[PDB]
């Protein structure tokens, strides 16, 4: 179905340039108040283990982990930040790759 768009879109932003922030989740032991700021936590390889386990319904589910992804980012990190930075290369990458199949 449409989910093979997904794996394409996912692969490629796990291979990106900017990606290092979003391979694995947040280590809150590590990142002072993440665990207090970010409720719903979300990553590229927690995205990757639901793809190959098939839980994802539609493409749009991905998306909106793709952009939880995102939100978070800019939720915690400032824009100015390397994190931040890198979100939003990721963020606008993701968009672009997004709307080129749908
Ligand atoms: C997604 C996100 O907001 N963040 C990801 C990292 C992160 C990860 C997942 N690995 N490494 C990081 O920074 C160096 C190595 C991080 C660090 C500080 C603040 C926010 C952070
Ligand atoms: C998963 C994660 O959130 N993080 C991982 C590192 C990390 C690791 C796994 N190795 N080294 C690191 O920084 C020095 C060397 C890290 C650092 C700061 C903030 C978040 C971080």
Not at 21 to 29: A, G, H, I, S
Not at 63 to 78: G, K, M, R, S, Y
Not at 81 to 100: L, N, P, Q, T
């Amino acid at each position: 179905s449409d989910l093979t768009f997904c794996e394409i879109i996912l692969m490629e932003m796990e291979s990106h340039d900017a990606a290092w922030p979003f391979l694995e989740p947040v280590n809150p032991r590590l990142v002072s108040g993440y665990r207090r700021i970010i409720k719903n936590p979300m990553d590229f390889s927690t995205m990757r283990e639901r793809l190959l386990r098939g839980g994802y319904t539609s493409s749009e589910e991905f998306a909106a982990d793709a952009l939880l992804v995102f939100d978070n980012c800019q939720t915690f990190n400032e824009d100015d930040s390397e994190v931040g930075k890198a979100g939003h290369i990721m963020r606008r990458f993701f968009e672009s790759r997004w709307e080129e199949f749908y």
